[PDB]
Design a protein around this ligand. Structure first.
Ligand SMILES: *[C@@H]1O[C@H](CO)[C@@H](O)[C@H](O)[C@H]1NC(C)=O
Lengths: 180, 191, 49, 123, 48, 48
């Protein structure tokens, strides 16, 4: 019979975020109290923590830096500063020089329509090596490289993703795991 | 003379978000608090067969304005419009809600979203089941008049307001003031 | 896309950067049970003759 | 198995099914690393943009570092994802927020010789 | 009172990536071509 | 990934094009109401 003296309401938390402590206890020393030995078997206080989370410092960015000169193939200017506001915001630029040094990447290999550069040996082999069926577009005859259609390795794409060491979530896809 | 009073009220509100199987777990809560193992496995298979794209990271929507007529001007005006949208109906305007309730703005009306096992007009009744620490947390006030662009800085100066920390709860988390660079009409509309 | 914890095959796109087949699920439970019982009995008897 | 873990008491029946499901679709647990700048090799101008990417990675490591994040309550490893710092909880810890290398120093002045140094502290 | 905590880890099948002549993906090689010639840390951090 | 020529939707692109050149909060308010304030970059799809 301990709840006969109802516990008071929980007091205010001791601090805001760092560390919190609150306690509660209306016990009257009447005949019922002294004749039932409630002093020895019943607790007189209950303590527990409150707001056990840390105190995260507010994300504080810095002022913008000087405008960076632009010489890309796309007229965009960079502006970097060190949250909900964008980290780096790019705007249209006034380019002193437009795109240059544009040429064909492939020299002794085949140039896929999507930009990929694969060896000419991989053309007309009954397999989509470019990704957009560019090599197998109009092949009059193809050489069977594999006798039977086999299934791919399951979850093979997970071992091709990039890894961002800083973020703890590795990254999106960087390598292709369907090419053979 | 003998008198006896019996009163027991038990209510459950399951939330199973499996399109068709979502209602099964909600209906099974009648007299069965523990979830069925087979029903849980069926709901897991359903959730595997249907994604739950919620709980993902966000990015500023106005950044997607890349190749449109008057692209950069429209992007800057959408920046300004999103700022005005964010600060026109921010929850700061609404008065604080009782029992740590969270206020929202739907058009021109405030709504005190009540914690579970609570109800009332302003989340005042039904404090029987709190299961929390308690107190009164802090809430950020509405941003004051913006800076007149003396040197480009900002003059938001978000300070405390009518709901101060009283019940021992933590104060409003975040920066007190803000600082940025005035656009100067966004470099006089991009050079 | 290869078959990972799903259907036979799936087709991605250029705008989509990645598809993942890592199934990770979490859970949490907080069950409580209590009982408070009270019993007070009093009796008296006085006889005078 | 995750659902039955509420009253598992060291269950073993569903362990075989869970192992079969893991063999069907596993998750990356252990792994070795290597610089991503070595993957760009078959582009038109490889060496130029490769050196540019190395410089960009140097400047990004100078900008963002794991030391910038606040430490964790119990030996946690803080990681920087965007503008927030999350603590990686080890085995035996839980919660939303659960020695380590400190921040590097500024690059010293370029001496008369090639030798230029940078100092990190394990504080 | 009683408290029991369990953990486990399985070394399921793996694979070793080849050292050289790795075949890049479509989206990566496409994004890798839009990079400017002159150094620009801002646009280079995007692909990072 | 965010930085690319992401193929926008027909209604989204149409409403973005119908926005007036001069600053007008009226159309941008309805656009923000219909389309929201942010778009998803990355993250899992775990249920609740
Ligand atoms: C008393 O407590 C026990 C504890 O398990 C419970 O099973 C029983 O239903 C309770 N009886 C009541 C509240 O009348």
């Amino acid at each position: 019979f301990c709840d006969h003296y109802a516990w008071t309401q929980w007091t205010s938390c001791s601090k805001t975020c760092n560390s919190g402590t609150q306690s509660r206890h209306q016990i009257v020393v009447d005949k019922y109290y002294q004749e039932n030995f409630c002093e020895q078997i019943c607790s007189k206080q209950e303590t527990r923590e409150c707001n056990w989370q840390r105190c995260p410092i507010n994300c504080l960015l810095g002022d913008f830096g000087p405008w960076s000169d632009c010489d890309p193939c796309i007229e965009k200017q960079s502006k970097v500063r060190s949250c909900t506001a964008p980290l780096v915001a790019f705007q249209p630029c006034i380019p002193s020089k437009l795109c240059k040094i544009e040429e064909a990447d492939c020299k002794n290999k085949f140039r896929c329509d999507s930009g990929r550069c694969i060896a000419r040996k991989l053309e007309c082999n009954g397999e989509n090596d470019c990704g957009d069926n560019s090599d197998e577009r109009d092949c009059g005859r193809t050489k069977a490289v594999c006798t039977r259609k086999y299934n791919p390795i399951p979850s093979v794409q997970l071992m091709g993703n990039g890894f961002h060491f800083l973020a703890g979530e590795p990254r999106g896809e960087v390598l292709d795991n369907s090419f053979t | 003379a003998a008198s006896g009073t019996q009163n027991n009220v038990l209510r459950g509100e399951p939330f199973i978000r499996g399109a068709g199987f979502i209602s099964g777990l909600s209906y099974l809560e009648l007299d069965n608090p523990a979830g069925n193992k087979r029903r849980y496995s069926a709901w897991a298979e359903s959730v595997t067969n249907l994604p739950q794209v919620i709980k993902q990271k966000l990015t500023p929507l106005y950044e997607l304005v890349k190749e449109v007529p008057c692209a950069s001007v429209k992007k800057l005006y959408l920046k300004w419009a999103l700022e005005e949208y964010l600060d026109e109906f921010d929850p700061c305007h609404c008065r604080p809600c009782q029992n740590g309730g969270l206020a929202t703005v739907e058009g021109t009306h405030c709504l005190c979203h009540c914690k579970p096992y609570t109800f009332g007009a302003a989340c005042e009744q039904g404090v029987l089941v709190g299961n929390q620490a308690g107190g009164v947390d802090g809430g950020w006030s509405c941003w004051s008049s913006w800076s007149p662009c003396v040197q480009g800085k900002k003059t938001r100066s978000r300070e405390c307001n009518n709901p101060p920390p009283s019940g021992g709860g933590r104060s409003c988390v975040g920066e007190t003031t803000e600082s940025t660079q005035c656009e100067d009409e966004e470099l006089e509309h991009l050079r | 896309v290869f078959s990972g914890d799903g259907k036979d095959f799936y087709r991605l796109s250029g705008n989509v950067l990645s598809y993942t087949f890592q199934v990770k699920i979490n859970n949490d439970f907080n069950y409580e049970f209590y009982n408070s019982t009270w019993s007070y009995v009093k009796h008296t008897s006085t006889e005078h003759t | 198995l995750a659902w039955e873990k509420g009253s598992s008491g060291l269950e073993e029946k569903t362990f075989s099914e869970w192992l079969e499901s893991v063999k069907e679709n596993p998750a990356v647990i252990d792994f070795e690393l290597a610089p991503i700048v070595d993957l760009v090799r078959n582009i038109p101008c490889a060496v130029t943009k490769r050196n540019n990417l190395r410089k960009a990675l140097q400047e990004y490591a100078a900008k963002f570092d794991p030391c910038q994040c606040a430490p964790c309550p119990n030996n946690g490893r803080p990681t920087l994802s965007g503008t927030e710092c999350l603590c990686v909880c080890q085995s035996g810890t839980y919660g939303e927020n659960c020695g380590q290398w400190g921040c590097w120093s500024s690059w010293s002045t370029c001496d008369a010789t090639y030798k230029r140094s940078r100092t990190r502290e394990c504080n | 009172s009683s408290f029991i905590r369990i953990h486990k880890v399985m070394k399921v099948l793996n694979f070793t990536t080849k050292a050289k002549d790795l075949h890049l993906s479509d989206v990566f090689l496409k994004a890798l071509n839009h990079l400017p010639l002159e150094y620009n840390s801002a646009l280079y951090s995007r692909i990072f | 990934n965010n930085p690319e020529f992401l193929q926008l939707a027909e209604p989204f692109w149409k409403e973005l094009s119908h926005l007036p050149s001069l600053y007008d909060y009226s159309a941008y308010r309805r656009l923000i109401d219909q389309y929201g304030t942010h778009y998803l970059q990355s993250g899992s799809l775990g249920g609740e």
